[PDB]
Coordinates of all heavy atoms in Angstrom, one line a residue:
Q1 N 87.6 -170.6 32.4 CA 88.4 -171.1 33.5 C 87.8 -172.4 34.0 O 88.5 -173.1 34.9 CB 88.5 -170.1 34.7 CG 89.5 -169.0 34.3 CD 89.3 -167.8 35.2 OE1 88.9 -167.8 36.3 NE2 89.8 -166.6 34.7
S2 N 86.7 -172.9 33.6 CA 86.1 -174.1 34.1 C 86.5 -175.3 33.2 O 86.6 -175.1 32.0 CB 84.6 -174.0 34.2 OG 84.0 -175.2 34.4
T3 N 86.7 -176.4 33.8 CA 86.8 -177.7 33.0 C 85.5 -178.5 33.1 O 85.4 -179.6 32.7 CB 88.0 -178.5 33.5 OG1 87.9 -178.7 34.9 CG2 89.3 -177.9 33.1
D4 N 84.4 -177.9 33.7 CA 83.1 -178.5 33.9 C 82.2 -178.2 32.7 O 81.7 -177.0 32.7 CB 82.5 -178.1 35.2 CG 81.2 -178.8 35.6 OD1 80.7 -179.5 34.7 OD2 80.7 -178.6 36.7
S5 N 81.9 -179.1 31.8 CA 81.1 -178.8 30.7 C 79.7 -178.4 31.0 O 79.1 -177.6 30.3 CB 81.1 -180.0 29.7 OG 80.6 -181.2 30.4
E6 N 79.2 -178.8 32.2 CA 77.8 -178.4 32.5 C 77.8 -177.0 33.0 O 76.8 -176.3 32.7 CB 77.3 -179.3 33.6 CG 76.7 -180.6 33.1 CD 76.1 -181.6 34.1 OE1 76.1 -181.2 35.3 OE2 75.6 -182.7 33.8
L7 N 78.8 -176.5 33.7 CA 78.9 -175.0 33.9 C 79.0 -174.2 32.7 O 78.3 -173.2 32.5 CB 80.1 -174.8 34.9 CG 80.3 -173.3 35.2 CD1 79.0 -172.7 35.9 CD2 81.5 -173.1 36.1
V8 N 79.8 -174.7 31.7 CA 79.9 -173.9 30.5 C 78.5 -173.9 29.8 O 78.1 -172.8 29.3 CB 81.0 -174.5 29.6 CG1 81.0 -173.9 28.2 CG2 82.4 -174.5 30.2
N9 N 77.8 -175.0 29.7 CA 76.5 -175.0 29.1 C 75.5 -174.1 29.7 O 74.7 -173.4 29.1 CB 75.9 -176.4 29.1 CG 76.7 -177.4 28.2 OD1 77.5 -177.0 27.4 ND2 76.4 -178.7 28.3
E10 N 75.6 -174.0 31.1 CA 74.6 -173.1 31.8 C 75.0 -171.6 31.5 O 74.1 -170.8 31.3 CB 74.7 -173.4 33.3 CG 73.8 -172.4 34.1 CD 72.4 -172.5 33.8 OE1 71.9 -173.6 33.5 OE2 71.7 -171.4 33.8
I11 N 76.3 -171.3 31.4 CA 76.7 -170.0 31.1 C 76.3 -169.6 29.7 O 75.8 -168.5 29.5 CB 78.2 -169.8 31.3 CG1 78.6 -169.9 32.8 CG2 78.7 -168.5 30.7 CD1 80.1 -170.1 33.1
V12 N 76.5 -170.5 28.7 CA 76.0 -170.2 27.4 C 74.5 -169.9 27.3 O 74.1 -169.0 26.6 CB 76.4 -171.4 26.5 CG1 75.6 -171.3 25.1 CG2 77.9 -171.4 26.2
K13 N 73.7 -170.7 28.0 CA 72.3 -170.5 28.1 C 72.0 -169.1 28.7 O 71.1 -168.4 28.2 CB 71.6 -171.6 28.8 CG 70.1 -171.5 29.0 CD 69.7 -171.7 30.4 CE 68.2 -171.3 30.6 NZ 67.3 -172.3 30.2
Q14 N 72.6 -168.7 29.8 CA 72.4 -167.4 30.4 C 72.8 -166.3 29.4 O 72.1 -165.3 29.3 CB 73.1 -167.3 31.7 CG 72.6 -168.2 32.8 CD 71.2 -167.9 33.3 OE1 70.8 -166.8 33.4 NE2 70.5 -169.0 33.6
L15 N 73.9 -166.4 28.7 CA 74.4 -165.4 27.8 C 73.4 -165.2 26.6 O 73.2 -164.1 26.2 CB 75.7 -165.7 27.3 CG 76.8 -165.7 28.3 CD1 78.2 -165.9 27.7 CD2 76.9 -164.3 29.0
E16 N 72.8 -166.4 26.2 CA 71.8 -166.3 25.1 C 70.6 -165.5 25.5 O 70.0 -164.7 24.8 CB 71.4 -167.7 24.6 CG 72.5 -168.4 23.8 CD 72.2 -169.9 23.6 OE1 71.3 -170.4 24.3 OE2 72.9 -170.5 22.8
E17 N 70.2 -165.7 26.8 CA 69.0 -164.9 27.3 C 69.4 -163.4 27.5 O 68.6 -162.5 27.2 CB 68.5 -165.5 28.5 CG 67.2 -164.8 29.1 CD 66.1 -164.9 28.0 OE1 65.9 -165.9 27.4 OE2 65.3 -163.8 27.9
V18 N 70.7 -163.1 27.9 CA 71.1 -161.8 28.1 C 71.1 -161.0 26.7 O 70.6 -159.9 26.6 CB 72.4 -161.7 28.8 CG1 73.0 -160.3 28.7 CG2 72.4 -162.2 30.2
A19 N 71.6 -161.7 25.7 CA 71.5 -161.1 24.3 C 70.1 -160.9 23.9 O 69.8 -159.9 23.2 CB 72.3 -162.1 23.4
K20 N 69.2 -161.8 24.2 CA 67.8 -161.6 23.8 C 67.2 -160.4 24.4 O 66.4 -159.6 23.8 CB 67.0 -162.9 24.2 CG 65.7 -163.0 23.5 CD 64.7 -164.0 24.2 CE 63.4 -164.1 23.4 NZ 62.7 -165.3 23.7
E21 N 67.5 -160.1 25.7 CA 66.9 -159.0 26.5 C 67.6 -157.7 26.3 O 67.0 -156.7 26.6 CB 66.8 -159.4 27.9 CG 66.0 -160.7 28.2 CD 65.4 -160.8 29.6 OE1 65.5 -159.9 30.4 OE2 64.9 -161.9 29.8
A22 N 68.8 -157.7 25.8 CA 69.5 -156.5 25.5 C 69.0 -155.7 24.3 O 68.6 -156.3 23.3 CB 71.0 -156.8 25.3
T23 N 69.0 -154.4 24.3 CA 68.3 -153.6 23.3 C 69.3 -152.9 22.3 O 68.8 -152.4 21.3 CB 67.4 -152.6 23.9 OG1 68.1 -151.6 24.7 CG2 66.4 -153.3 24.9
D24 N 70.6 -152.9 22.6 CA 71.5 -152.2 21.7 C 72.1 -153.2 20.7 O 72.6 -154.3 21.0 CB 72.6 -151.6 22.5 CG 73.7 -150.9 21.6 OD1 73.5 -149.7 21.3 OD2 74.7 -151.5 21.2
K25 N 71.9 -152.9 19.4 CA 72.3 -153.9 18.3 C 73.7 -154.2 18.4 O 74.1 -155.4 18.2 CB 71.9 -153.3 17.0 CG 72.5 -154.0 15.8 CD 72.0 -153.3 14.6 CE 72.8 -153.9 13.4 NZ 72.0 -154.8 12.6
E26 N 74.6 -153.3 18.5 CA 76.1 -153.6 18.6 C 76.4 -154.4 19.8 O 77.2 -155.4 19.8 CB 76.9 -152.3 18.5 CG 78.4 -152.5 18.3 CD 79.1 -153.0 19.6 OE1 78.7 -152.5 20.7 OE2 80.1 -153.8 19.5
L27 N 75.8 -154.1 21.0 CA 76.0 -154.9 22.2 C 75.5 -156.4 21.9 O 76.2 -157.3 22.4 CB 75.2 -154.3 23.3 CG 75.1 -155.1 24.6 CD1 76.5 -155.3 25.3 CD2 74.2 -154.3 25.6
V28 N 74.4 -156.6 21.3 CA 73.9 -157.9 21.1 C 74.9 -158.7 20.2 O 75.1 -159.9 20.5 CB 72.5 -157.9 20.5 CG1 72.0 -159.3 20.0 CG2 71.5 -157.3 21.4
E29 N 75.4 -158.1 19.1 CA 76.3 -158.8 18.2 C 77.6 -159.1 19.0 O 78.2 -160.2 18.8 CB 76.6 -157.9 17.0 CG 75.4 -157.6 16.2 CD 75.6 -156.6 15.1 OE1 76.5 -155.8 15.1 OE2 74.7 -156.6 14.1
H30 N 78.0 -158.2 19.9 CA 79.2 -158.5 20.7 C 79.0 -159.7 21.6 O 79.8 -160.6 21.7 CB 79.5 -157.2 21.5 CG 80.8 -157.2 22.1 ND1 81.8 -158.2 22.1 CD2 81.5 -156.2 22.8 CE1 82.9 -157.8 22.7 NE2 82.7 -156.6 23.2
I31 N 77.8 -159.8 22.3 CA 77.5 -160.9 23.1 C 77.5 -162.2 22.3 O 78.0 -163.3 22.7 CB 76.2 -160.7 23.9 CG1 76.3 -159.5 24.8 CG2 75.8 -161.9 24.7 CD1 75.0 -159.0 25.3
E32 N 76.8 -162.2 21.1 CA 76.8 -163.4 20.3 C 78.1 -163.8 19.8 O 78.4 -165.0 19.7 CB 75.8 -163.2 19.1 CG 74.4 -162.9 19.6 CD 73.4 -162.5 18.5 OE1 73.9 -161.9 17.5 OE2 72.2 -162.7 18.6
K33 N 79.0 -162.8 19.7 CA 80.4 -163.2 19.3 C 81.1 -163.9 20.4 O 81.8 -165.0 20.2 CB 81.1 -162.0 18.8 CG 82.6 -162.2 18.6 CD 83.3 -160.9 18.5 CE 84.5 -161.0 17.5 NZ 85.6 -161.6 18.2
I34 N 80.9 -163.4 21.7 CA 81.5 -164.1 22.8 C 80.9 -165.5 23.0 O 81.5 -166.5 23.4 CB 81.3 -163.2 24.1 CG1 82.2 -162.0 24.0 CG2 81.6 -164.0 25.4 CD1 81.8 -160.9 24.9
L35 N 79.5 -165.6 22.8 CA 78.8 -166.8 22.8 C 79.4 -167.9 21.9 O 79.6 -169.0 22.4 CB 77.3 -166.6 22.4 CG 76.4 -166.4 23.6 CD1 75.0 -165.9 23.2 CD2 76.3 -167.7 24.3

């Protein structure tokens, strides 16, 4: 919903760290797919 590329970049960075810290393999693949 944002047209602000800097917000999108920050969200992508946060999602990458959430995927790193998550422990369920299927969940991680799901997050990387959204990423």
Side-chain angles (χ1 to χ4, degrees):
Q1 286 164 22
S2 167
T3 53
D4 184 353
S5 55
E6 278 182 1
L7 179 57
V8 174
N9 291 348
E10 174 66 35
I11 291 169
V12 164
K13 181 233 167 79
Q14 294 294 324
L15 295 180
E16 288 168 349
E17 185 59 43
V18 168
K20 196 199 182 162
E21 299 204 9
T23 63
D24 176 90
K25 163 177 169 108
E26 191 283 325
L27 172 63
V28 171
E29 300 174 337
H30 197 355
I31 299 166
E32 298 171 332
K33 171 196 213 278
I34 292 163
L35 262 170

